[PDB]
Structures are given as C-alpha cells and as structure tokens.
From Swiss-Prot:
Residues 9-114, 115-216, 217-319, 320-420 form the Cadherin domain. Belongs to the G-protein coupled receptor 2 family. LN-TM7 subfamily. Glycans are attached at N61, N205. It is found in: Cell membrane. This is Cadherin EGF LAG seven-pass G-type receptor 1. The iron and 2-oxoglutarate dependent 3-hydroxylation of aspartate and asparagine is (R) stereospecific within EGF domains.
Length: 420
C-alpha cells in the first residue's frame, strides 16, 4: 500500500557552476525521500520544462545527479530556470515537483574588442598641444573584465598621450607636431582586461601648415655700385629661408618703398639698376624689402638694403678763369711768382684731387715752373726782353683718377716789363 509522496531535501534547488566545467561535471544532487519501502519507495527523477537557446544539463534517472552534458557559456546564458519531478514505482504512483535554478559563473575567456575595426585621421601640423585627437572604445563580453588602454608603439618623439578612462581611451597631443620630422604616425593602442589584450593601429597623417615666417640672411645688407654701371646691372641677391613646405615656404620679394632707380626680381630676390646713377647727385639709397611666403594666411619678414654709390672719374678739371695774364720786371730773380692758377673737379677722392703742371703744356723753354699742388707760377731763370717780351704759357690741371686720368689746359700770358 503506497501511502507516502516523495519529499525533496531542499525546498527549491539552486546551484552556481563556472562556465568552464568539463562535460560530466556534477552540478547538483537532487534528492527525495519516499517514506515507504520496496517499489512504493523507489524513485525515478526527470527534468521538466517550466526558453533559453541551449539546455546543457541532464539528470540521472535513479541517482538524482544533474551533470553538464554540453559545454557552458556565461556569454550565451547566465541563468537557467527549470523543474525536476520525483516519481515512485507505485501501482497508484505518487510524485512531487520543485524548481531548479542554475547560475553560470564568469571566467575570462574573451579578448577585449575595439568597436571600430580600423582607425584613420588627419591632423593639421598646428593642432594645439592638449587638443583631442581620437577616443577609442573596446568592449569585453566577460562581466568581470575592466579595460585599461595603453599607447604601446609608434609614439615617435613622445608626440601623443593616452588617458585610460571608463568610456574608453583618449589620445591627446602631448608635444607639438613638425611636418619636417614626421609626416605620419602609426600608434599601437592595446586594450587589456589585465590578462588578455588586442592592439588597434591609428593611422595619423599630418598636413603642413604655415607655422613659420621667412627669415632674411641679414636684417641689414650693404652693397656698393660704381656710378659707371649701365642700366640693368645686378648689384645683389637678397635671400630669405622658410622652414615650412611648398607655397608655405616659397618666397616673393617686394620693395616696400619703391624708387625709379632700382627694381627687384620677385622670384630670385636679385636687385637690378633701372636708371643711370650719379655720385655727384646722390651717394646712397636705403630700401626696405619684404620677403612674403605664399601660405594661407601669409607671413613675411623685412630687411634694410643700403646701396652705396662709388664715385667714378666722370668729371674733367675746370680752371676758374678761361685765361690768365700777369707781368714781372725783366731784372727779377728766379722763384719770383707771376700768378696762381686754380681748378675745381666735381669728383671726390683721387678723382677730385689736382696736379698743376706744364707737362703737355708750354713753360717758355724752361723759363718758368709751376708748384704741383698750389698752382703758383714762378720764374725759373733770369729773363731777357731782347729774347722774349711776352710768353704764351700753357698750364694743365690733371686729376689722379685711376681707370684713366682727366685734365684741362689754360693759357697764361706773361708780359716782361722794361727797365727805364
Ligand atoms: Ca511512496
Ligand atoms: Ca564563455
Ligand atoms: Ca575578458
Ligand atoms: Ca566569460
Ligand atoms: Ca612659411
Ligand atoms: Ca657723375
Ligand atoms: Ca664722379
Ligand atoms: Ca675728375
Ligand atoms: Cl686781371
Ligand atoms: Mg555553446
Ligand atoms: Na609648417
């Protein structure tokens, strides 16, 4: 006579299991006590449905042990809710049912995964230090995985910085860019859960910017030019150098205060004369000159050029009087002055400095001489009106001009006065 319903040992059943356990792992012993003996007391166990995408457990129909019969995965199903039923082999058979809960415990069996498969961007070379470059996010399907981000290769000259945070991993500019040193970076970034990792690559191209001004070779050029030089003489080649690239570094030269006498070639920075120059009119010119790059926006420098005109022997001496006349008594001793000639020369230096001489002239067959620097004409000999009563002397003023010296001549008449 079958008088007792099978009673379970725990009120409902509950168990946890690492997602790791092998096929065969004993999860829970379901136990029931029938209060009879014989077959009135003999129990069979069965799992009942009370939807999960898998059901990786089974119960042994006599022992009551639930074992894993397919590999578990917490990232597929954390929690399984189902039932178990115990039944006696009684001719009127009795049974009871309870619930079973199995919670699956997390193991670190997933790598962190970047949210983008690929990372690419373009930075302007003048991007500010501190500015944001990129935020990278990875995710880990494990519940118990904290993600730390780290810059782990290709940070050349330590240009970039990476703050690791809750959301993800922020890249900033730590130190200034320079197109002349690096056009490109390939930053490795690794996402780690503390044991597993993945490494993303960030391709960064740098666009040259106009971060430099031309710098002239000098802030004050001085060059010299003979007043001789024809129209179209090159007199100097100014240059500025710009550390940028392309148009940002290509120089246009510009006279800021133009004069008719000079022009510049804007591409080559060469200065040419545009007119005849005259030392006797202006000895010096000063120009202010710009070098502008061709960047957007444009930058520029400034220098002064001082142009010194060099004097040329382009002026001939000129006597103050076109004719001189003087007298002396016949009985006068040697070294008696008759008179002093003078000349001027509009040139300076040796070009303007004067020698008075009878050479190329006439000194009355040696009867007179002239002092080279003073121009004073003197008797050299005793005189005789029997012989010469009236000399027609010819004096020369010669400059000391190098390339070829210039001169002028003047007539001096010398009357020899009688003795009563
Ligand atoms: Ca029973
Ligand atoms: Ca798993
Ligand atoms: Ca993980
Ligand atoms: Ca896991
Ligand atoms: Ca520039
Ligand atoms: Ca002149
Ligand atoms: Ca001159
Ligand atoms: Ca002269
Ligand atoms: Cl006179
Ligand atoms: Mg699976
Ligand atoms: Na630049």
């Amino acid at each position: 006579v079958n008088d007792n319903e099978p009673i379970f040992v725990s009120s409902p059943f509950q168990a946890t299991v690492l997602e790791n356990v092998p096929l065969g792992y004993p999860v829970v012993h379901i136990q029931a006590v029938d209060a009879d003996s014989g077959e009135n007391a003999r129990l069979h166990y069965r799992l009942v449905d009370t939807p999960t995408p898998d059901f990786p457990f089974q119960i042994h129909n006599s022992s009551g042990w639930i074992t894993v019969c397919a590999e578990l995965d917490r990232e597929e199903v954390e929690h399984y809710s189902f039932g178990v039923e115990a039944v006696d082999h009684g001719s009127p058979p009795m049974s009871s049912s309870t619930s079973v809960s199995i919670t699956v415990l997390d193991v670190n069996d997933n790598d962190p995964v970047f949210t983008q498969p690929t990372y690419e961007l373009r930075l302007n070379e003048d991007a500010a230090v501190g500015s944001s470059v990129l935020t990278l996010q990875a995710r880990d399907r494990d519940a118990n995985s904290v993600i730390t981000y780290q810059l782990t290769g290709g940070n050349t000259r330590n240009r970039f910085a990476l703050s690791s945070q809750r959301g993800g991993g922020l890249i900033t500019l730590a130190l200034p860019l320079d197109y002349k040193q690096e056009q490109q970076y390939v930053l490795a970034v690794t996402a780690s859960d503390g044991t597993r990792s993945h490494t993303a690559h960030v391709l960064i191209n740098v666009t040259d910017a106009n971060t430099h001004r031309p710098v002239f070779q000098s802030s004050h050029y001085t060059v010299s030019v003979s007043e001789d030089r024809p129209v179209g003489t090159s007199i100097a080649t100014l240059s500025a150098n710009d550390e940028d690239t392309g148009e940002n570094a290509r120089i246009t030269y510009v006279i800021q205060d133009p004069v008719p006498q000079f022009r510049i070639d804007p591409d080559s920075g060469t200065m040419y004369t545009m007119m005849e120059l005259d030392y006797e009119n202006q000895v010096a010119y000063t120009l202010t000159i710009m070098a502008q790059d061709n960047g957007i926006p444009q930058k520029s420098d400034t220098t002064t050029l001082e142009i010194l005109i060099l004097d040329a022997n382009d002026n001939a001496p000129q006597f103050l009087w076109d004719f001189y006349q003087g007298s002396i008594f016949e009985d006068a001793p040697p070294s008696t002055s008759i008179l002093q000639v003078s000349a001027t020369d509009r040139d300076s230096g040796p070009n303007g400095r004067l020698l008075y001489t009878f050479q190329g002239g006439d000194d009355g067959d040696g009867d007179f001489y002239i002092e080279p620097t003073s121009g004073v004409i003197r008797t050299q000999r005793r005189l005789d009106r029997e012989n010469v009563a009236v000399y027609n002397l010819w004096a020369l003023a010669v400059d000391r001009g190098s390339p070829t010296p210039l001169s002028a001549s003047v007539e001096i008449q010398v009357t020899i006065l009688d003795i009563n």
